């Protein structure tokens, strides 16, 4: 947890994937997020948060859904395909 907070302060946008084992969409995003991290190695860095394991992290940022992608700059709720996420990063940087 501490390591994540240190990374949040550093940088190079940082993307948080909020997911739960039970939620089907969240499972879909992790493979998409893994593919995004492999594709992007410089523009941004990705971290995965299990909402089940880190309830404190979730409440603090006001996560509204089990599968949510967060980068303060912008917040995407619900499953999204790679192309949409990538484009949102591109402009937002």
């Amino acid at each position: 947890e501490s390591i994540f907070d240190e990374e949040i302060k550093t940088s190079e946008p940082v993307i948080v994937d909020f997911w739960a084992p039970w939620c089907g969409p969240s499972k879909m995003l992790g493979p998409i997020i893994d593919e995004l991290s492999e594709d992007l190695d410089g523009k941004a860095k990705f971290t995965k948060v299990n909402v089940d394991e880190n309830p404190g992290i979730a409440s603090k940022f006001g996560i509204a859904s089990i599968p949510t992608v967060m980068i303060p700059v912008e917040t995407l709720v619900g499953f999204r395909p790679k192309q949409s996420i990538t484009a949102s990063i591109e402009k937002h940087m």
Partner: protein, 279 residues
């Protein structure tokens, strides 16, 4: 086992797409009702379908049914809950089973509108089962369009401090005692920063979260990431949506609602979908 093409809907567009995809030796699956389309069967007389002057809807429906049966095309009698565009393929989600296919074609016809949902979607829900733990000890309201929604409402009662269930259908409700039934017409969702209250015609409910569990999902929700403008799926000349390898045809695209456009739109989608498999 992944099919080459998956067709969402068994209406004129879906069938028109199906026969063209099957013609070119590509594996095809069609999701829909055993009856092709309620509109086809219901139509009294059709004069604007070229070649079938004065044919009854049910009579035209028969001609279409013969076409696919004679071609060995079977309708998968299931409803598609969700379709997740993975990048190279599409995962199709259904309560009874899960399928994946390399290309998708949408033939959903028309769906019910949403009241002021999209204003604070982040602080609103659609999955319910996904978001229940977040609302532990909080007020939850459910707008139910089917029995599955009732069951989700019973589930929420276990976690939430208060659960409201608003039925849009008239039926006996199988609900636990904790759930409160609210028989009124939803109007608007309002909140300052996040959802705070749901306004009905003759009642107001203060609630932290609102869940709208729908029987006929909109295209945007059914396919996460699909670009929809003016209530109809966006398509270019080839019937391509914003998602690569995802096509749409028929009433869903948004042009005049007619059989001959629907079949044409379906054909163009299928032929182009086949083209993309190669090259």
């Amino acid at each position: 086992e992944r099919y080459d093409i998956a067709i969402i809907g068994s209406g004129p567009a879906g069938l028109a797409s199906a026969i063209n995809a099957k013609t070119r030796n590509k594996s095809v699956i069609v999701f829909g009702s055993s009856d092709l389309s309620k509109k086809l069967t219901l139509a009294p007389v059709i004069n604007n379908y070229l070649g079938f002057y004065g044919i009854r809807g049910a009579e035209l429906q028969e001609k279409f049914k013969e076409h696919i049966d004679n071609m060995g095309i079977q309708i998968e009698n299931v409803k598609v809950n969700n379709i997740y565009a993975m990048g190279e393929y599409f995962s199709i989600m259904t309560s009874k089973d899960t399928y994946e296919a390399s290309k998708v074609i949408l033939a959903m016809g028309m769906e019910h509108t949403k009241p002021l949902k999209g204003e604070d979607k982040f602080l609103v829900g659609y999955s319910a089962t996904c978001d229940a733990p977040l609302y532990k000890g909080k007020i939850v309201t459910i707008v139910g369009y089917n029995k599955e929604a009732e069951s989700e409402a019973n589930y929420l009662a276990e976690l939430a401090s208060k659960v409201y269930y608003v039925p849009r259908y008239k039926d006996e409700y199988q609900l636990v005692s904790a759930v409160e039934i609210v028989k009124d017409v939803p109007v608007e969702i309002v909140g300052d920063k996040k959802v705070e209250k749901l306004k009905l015609k003759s009642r107001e409910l203060e609630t932290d979260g609102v869940f709208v569990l729908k029987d006929s999902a909109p295209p945007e929700q059914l396919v996460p990431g699909l670009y929809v403008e003016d209530g109809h799926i966006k398509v270019n000349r080839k019937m391509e949506t914003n998602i690569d390898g995802c096509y749409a045809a028929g009433d869903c695209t948004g042009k005049p609602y007619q059989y001959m456009k629907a079949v044409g739109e379906g054909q163009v989608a299928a032929l182009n979908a086949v083209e993309k498999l190669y090259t």
